């Protein structure tokens, strides 16, 4: 889409419609007549554009009400009420951009931001755009979080997330232009190897990914169609619908066999009852033959008691021959029938042991995507982000992903090796309380009006607390971090000097030897300008492989790619890195899934801020005081880089709404 | 509202494997029973429709009787007269074969006779006799 409409879509906006936040905003514009809607509509569309064109400066309300033209532009209030509507809520001026108007000299009230990663960054960002007094505290000695960067030499390469997913409606399309980014695409074409280090042929390889995919929409029919979600009080995960289906599958295969087959026992049975008729037959000819013969042998002349009687016993036994051919079509008939039955047997398996092996690569890369063993992801709800996808070629980042946050924490007050470890929130501020990483003795305390929680869900769901909240989370809070899941993905750093691998091919995988096993090392990306290979642990596996060296792991990869290329082509690396992200203590995994017996809702309730209770009992009720944002606390978009910015800029507008007041509602 | 073509999930079916955990398997494994007992019970006809294929060997070719070809006249002669009421005895009223017995008369005539020389060939009484056995 292009125009004015492009920018709507490119904002994740509808162009022809108010969104909910809108009427929140304008309830009198919404309620209004349908004329003042579309004027609203448009003013919005066009700001969205003049900010979309370029995003390097930012866009003054002045700036914007002069490319409006009448009648738009007649109604200055509109337009001040769209233009900061929009740049509270970060649909314009936010990244990095160049200030027309340079900041207040004095700020208005405080704020602790815990975690440095990218939504920590983007809100603070936001917040200090806002004037207001913005602290970032990290327990890293860099920023990014779980955007990280291995840089060594000129070797460059992601150990975090590096795959931006497509640039149609997607906020880092922005930031792209903001920094610079290699963006180069992922060309999709995946050749797949088996163990034996052969390709996998096109007959396989299609046919396998087509039952794949045929596999998945069938649970979605189990789920949506048939109501299978739940199982002996439980809820069912996309694991279990897979094996379901896999087995009614197998079922149904034997199902036709036996069918098959009982088509042929009738039909012999048939020509059993046909042959016994036949021989029976026979031996009444053998029999009047003899009969007509003794009876013929008389010679003439006769009386014609013994004439009638050779001419009947003629008769009887051109009868019966009669009878006998006829059978004998009967049975030509029936002796073809089983010829072709047995001819087109139906098809011997479900699946061969090969197939199987192949089928579990596509559930590995499923279970990369995601995070998680596939036994844990909700049936129901595991594809609800579907509907939001951005549109465009999938793109990796040749200089390292690292370089946003980086450019992000530019200009910002950050507190690195500062293990945030209590958070005090009262009806009249908060108080933060940290020590240094280096040194756990060095305590710190830090004041403030309200604090922004990025932790990580892995980090809040760690029992026993690593940061303790005073008082504690609520019970709606807390169970919604229990239900939901945190997943965990690791990645192998191969650092060559040959090029040895198919330069034009991105990526190409490794089938496992078994379904438990299917995650280890699955998958390869040829990503990078320098020879670096990246290699996947995903699923079950990648729990397990944080349990082994670096030493060890690299072995199995050298092995892997040995049979892919020959003893001979694949040198020892020169550089080498393994991740643990549910070993890191800052993360405990990698990002978010939906859980079974999780949902969506569960990513709203993360995000919901905490209010105090009144500190004199009969006050009024209070402010609140802390705030939620990252990957985990934004129910459209999670478990992306994308969605913890936008998280950011969320509670940036939220904060600055509560603290700074929105004259724009009026 | 179809499941994809070549899925087979029927709603009795899901009960079916989802009982028990060994459900899926003890089905699976029914069906494995089924298949063997068929297929053998297959080579079992498979070996007595080969036995009694066998017995009709030579087929009926040495007991065959050469086409006898006759133009059909229509005079009776008595000898023609005395097979015909031969053949009512021992035929009842089947006239195709009464026809194939006389050779040179066609059904219709066999049933022309049945009413010229019913009285005097006494039909009637020959009919009851070939009604009792
Ligand atoms: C770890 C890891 C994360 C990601 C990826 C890989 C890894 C290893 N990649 C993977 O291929 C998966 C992938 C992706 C692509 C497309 C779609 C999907 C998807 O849809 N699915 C549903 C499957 C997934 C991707 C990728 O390519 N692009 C991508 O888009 N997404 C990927 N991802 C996720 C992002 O990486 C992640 O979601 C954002 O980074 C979130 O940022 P956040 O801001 O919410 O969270 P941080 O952790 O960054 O920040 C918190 C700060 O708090 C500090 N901290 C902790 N504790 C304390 C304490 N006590 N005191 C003081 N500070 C503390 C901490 O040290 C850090 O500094």
Known sequence: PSGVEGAAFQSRLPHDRMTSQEAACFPDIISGPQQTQKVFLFIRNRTLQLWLDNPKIQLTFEATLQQLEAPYNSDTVLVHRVHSYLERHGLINFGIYKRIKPLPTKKTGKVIIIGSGVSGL???????????????????????????????????????????????????????????????????????????????????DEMVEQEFNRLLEATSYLSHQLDFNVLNNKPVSLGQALEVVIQLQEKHV????????????????????????????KEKIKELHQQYKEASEVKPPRDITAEFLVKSKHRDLTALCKEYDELAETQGKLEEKLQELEANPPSDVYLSSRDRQILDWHFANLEFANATPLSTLSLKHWDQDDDFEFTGSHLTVRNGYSCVPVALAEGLDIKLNTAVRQVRYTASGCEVIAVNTRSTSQTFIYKCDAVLCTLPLGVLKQQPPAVQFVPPLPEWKTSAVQRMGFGNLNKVVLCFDRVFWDPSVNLFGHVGSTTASRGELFLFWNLYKAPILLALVAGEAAGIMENISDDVIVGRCLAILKGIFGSSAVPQPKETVVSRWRADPWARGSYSYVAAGSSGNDYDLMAQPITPGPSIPGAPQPIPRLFFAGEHTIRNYPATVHGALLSGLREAGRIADQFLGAMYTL | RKPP?????????????????????????????????????????????????????????????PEVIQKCNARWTTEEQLLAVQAIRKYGRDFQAISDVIGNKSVVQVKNFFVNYRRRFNIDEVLQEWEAE
């Open chain 2, 5 to 65: 073509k070549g899925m087979f999930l029927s709603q009795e079916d899901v009960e079916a494997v989802s009982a028990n955990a060994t459900a899926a398997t003890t089905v699976l494994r029914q069906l494995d029973m089924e298949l063997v007992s068929v297929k053998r019970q297959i080579q079992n006809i498979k070996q007595t429709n080969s036995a009694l294929k066998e017995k009709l060997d030579g087929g009926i070719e040495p007991y065959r009787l």
């Open chain 1, 122 to 204: 983007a809100a603070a960002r936001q917040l200090q755009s806002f004037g207001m007094d913005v602290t970032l505290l990290e327990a890293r000695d860099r920023v990014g979080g779980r955007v990280a960067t291995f840089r060594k030499g000129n070797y460059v390469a992601d150990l975090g997330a590096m795959v931006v997913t497509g640039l149609g409606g997607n906020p880092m399309a922005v930031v792209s232009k903001q920094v610079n980014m290699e963006l180069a695409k992922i060309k999709q074409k995946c050749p797949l190897y088996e163990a034996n280090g052969q390709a996998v042929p096109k007959e396989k």
């Open chain 1, 254 to 281: 034997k199902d036709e066999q036996i069918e098959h087959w009982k088509k042929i026992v009738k039909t012999q049975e048939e020509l059993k009852e046909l042959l016994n008729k036949m021989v029976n037959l």
